[PDB]
Amino acid sequence: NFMDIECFMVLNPSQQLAIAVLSLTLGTFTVLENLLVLCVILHSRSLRCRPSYHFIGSLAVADLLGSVIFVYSFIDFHVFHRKDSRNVFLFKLGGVTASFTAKVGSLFLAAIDRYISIHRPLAYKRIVTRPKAVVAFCLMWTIAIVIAVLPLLGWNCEKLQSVCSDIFPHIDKTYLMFWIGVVSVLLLFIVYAYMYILWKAGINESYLTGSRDERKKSLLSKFGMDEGVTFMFIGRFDRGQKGVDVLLKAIEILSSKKEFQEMRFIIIGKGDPELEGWARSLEEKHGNVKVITEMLSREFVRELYGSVDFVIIPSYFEPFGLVALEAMCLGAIPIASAVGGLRDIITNETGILVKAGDPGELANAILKALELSRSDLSKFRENCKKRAMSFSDQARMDIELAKTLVLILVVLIICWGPLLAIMVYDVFGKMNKLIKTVFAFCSMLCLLNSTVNPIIYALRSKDLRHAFRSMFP
Numbered sequence: 001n002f003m004d005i006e007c008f009m010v011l012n013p014s015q016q017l018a019i020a021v022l023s024l025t026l027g028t029f030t031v032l033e034n035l036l037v038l039c040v041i042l043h044s045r046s047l048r049c050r051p052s053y054h055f056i057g058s059l060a061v062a063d064l065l066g067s068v069i070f071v072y073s074f075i076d077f078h079v080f081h082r083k084d085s086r087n088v089f090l091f092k093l094g095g096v097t098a099s100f101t102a103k104v105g106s107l108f109l110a111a112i113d114r115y116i117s118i119h120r121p122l123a124y125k126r127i128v129t130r131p132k133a134v135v136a137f138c139l140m141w142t143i144a145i146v147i148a149v150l151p152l153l154g155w156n157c158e159k160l161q162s163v164c165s166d167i168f169p170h171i172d173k174t175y176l177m178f179w180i181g182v183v184s185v186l187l188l189f190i191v192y193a194y195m196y197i198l199w200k201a202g203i204n205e206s207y208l209t210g211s212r213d214e215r216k217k218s219l220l221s222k223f224g225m226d227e228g229v230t231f232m233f234i235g236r237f238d239r240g241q242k243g244v245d246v247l248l249k250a251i252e253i254l255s256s257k258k259e260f261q262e263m264r265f266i267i268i269g270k271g272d273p274e275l276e277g278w279a280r281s282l283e284e285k286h287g288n289v290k291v292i293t294e295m296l297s298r299e300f301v302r303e304l305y306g307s308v309d310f311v312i313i314p315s316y317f318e319p320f321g322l323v324a325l326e327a328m329c330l331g332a333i334p335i336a337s338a339v340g341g342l343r344d345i346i347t348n349e350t351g352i353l354v355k356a357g358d359p360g361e362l363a364n365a366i367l368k369a370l371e372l373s374r375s376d377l378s379k380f381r382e383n384c385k386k387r388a389m390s391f392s393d394q395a396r397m398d399i400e401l402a403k404t405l406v407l408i409l410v411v412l413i414i415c416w417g418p419l420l421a422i423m424v425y426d427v428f429g430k431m432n433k434l435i436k437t438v439f440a441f442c443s444m445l446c447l448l449n450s451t452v453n454p455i456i457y458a459l460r461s462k463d464l465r466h467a468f469r470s471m472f473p
């Protein structure tokens with residue numbers, strides 16, 4: 001309590017109405033459509049209860065209540081020259097800082113959703129549910145409320161006798177660095193988060209030409225073995241989760257059988273030196289097993305999925321169907337255990353289900369594979385080709401949404417970036433008359449942001465538009 005509050009009302013009476021009709025219209029064009037964006041969401045049973053678009057409510061609410069507060073209390077201050085209480089101002093201001101912090105945490109939670117929906121394609125539907133998404137936003141909001149009510153708890157320059165900010169009344173210049181700090185680094189990770197998801201997302205069986213018998217007759221000739229039935233395993237060597245130890249226990253016990261001559265096995269991986277010393281012995285002990293644990297070209301392995309006819313995923317549990325999807329897309333019947341996602345991607349009409357970590361029943365399911373016709377075999381390769389299109393499909397609709405989230409994050413950094421940076425110089429230096437009044441006119445960006453956020457839903461979201469013509473035809 002050294003300087004009074006009126007030294008902050010800088011707008012002369014000609015530029016207090018010009019800033020008013022801006023707040024009242026640009027603040028009406030955001031309340032109208034955000035209150036409308038909330039109407040499409042909660043009617044459409046699709047967008048309402050969905051963890052993918054759940055943020056569009058958490059984004060159109062912080063841009064509505066956080067906007068009506070900033071239109072009332074700002075016009076009631078720079079134009080109506082009102083001096084509230086010392087905790088009534090921080091209450092009215094706390095409702096604004098919480099909202100912006102909340103929409104940052106919305107672009108943060110929506111990034112966890114994006115990473116899971118793309119790089120955990122079938123774990124996603126079972127990790128990110130409606131319960132786990134409702135709890136994550138409510139506690140993301142719980143945090144956004146706390147950071148906003150700190151100066152109401154005693155992190156202010158009045159109740160602490162500290163240098164006040166030249167821009168915000170009743171607020172320390174350290175609470176700024178705690179609020180600009182936690183937000184600039186959050187956007188930094190968030191900006192870095194969506195760029196990792198997009199970069200590693202650009203990382204078709206119509207590229208492989210000819211019949212499969214030809215491409216498999218050319219493959220086994222490279223190894224020097226006869227046209228045989230080619231089983232394939234890909235993945236790290238371990239005994240903990242991948243079933244390479246299970247698979248080697250089956251190839252050995254199948255060797256004591258009459259049906260082993262026709263069976264051709266090919267394994268690639270890298271891991272336990274004793275698991276490698278076990279598999280490489282079979283490669284020279286048998287004339288029909290070849291193990292490749294060195295220099296595997298990523299498009300050569302692409303030729304394997306399309307040349308072979310069976311895929312072996314004997315893992316104890318698949319966290320994400322990385323081979324399961326690429327193999328089936330290239331029409332190679334996968335023989336995996338019904339653990340993890342491999343239950344609803346590999347079924348009794350798409351592949352062969354085995355018991356996890358069971359070496360005997362794995363072999364008994366390799367002999368079953370040897371005794372079936374092309375009628376069945378060509379039909380499984382189709383159902384593997386048909387299941388994959390339902391993935392590179394949704395995983396395409398997912399990738400389009402991680403572009404939408406960046407477009408929202410982009411126009412968030414553009415609107416709130418300059419304001420945030422003008423706050424930064426308040427911490428270090430002082431703010432003269434000019435730099436303090438340009439901030440009040442640049443302050444309108446948090447309303448323009450809430451004006452272009454509902455516009456870009458109606459441009460990117462393919463579902464939200466069709467939901468709009470459904471109740472307003």
Ligand SMILES: CCc1c(C(=O)NCCc2ccc(N3CCCCC3)cc2)[nH]c2ccc(Cl)cc12
Binds near residue numbers: 048056058059137
């Ligand atoms: C239902 C989630 C949701 C919101 C939303 O307001 N969550 C805020 C929930 C919440 C929880 C706790 C508090 N506390 C106040 C301070 C003291 C500690 C507890 C406050 C608020 N907004 C949404 C928009 C769309 C969708 Cl789909 C869901 C939501």
Ligand SMILES: CCCCCCC(C)(C)c1ccc([C@@H]2C[C@H](O)CC[C@H]2CCCO)c(O)c1
Binds near residue numbers: 069089179443
């Ligand atoms: C660490 C606090 C962050 C504040 C958010 C910045 C924001 C752009 C929302 C903002 C907030 C407040 C004002 C006005 C500053 C004037 O000095 C006093 C009146 C404020 C509006 C009343 C808020 O209840 C602002 O221009 C920008």
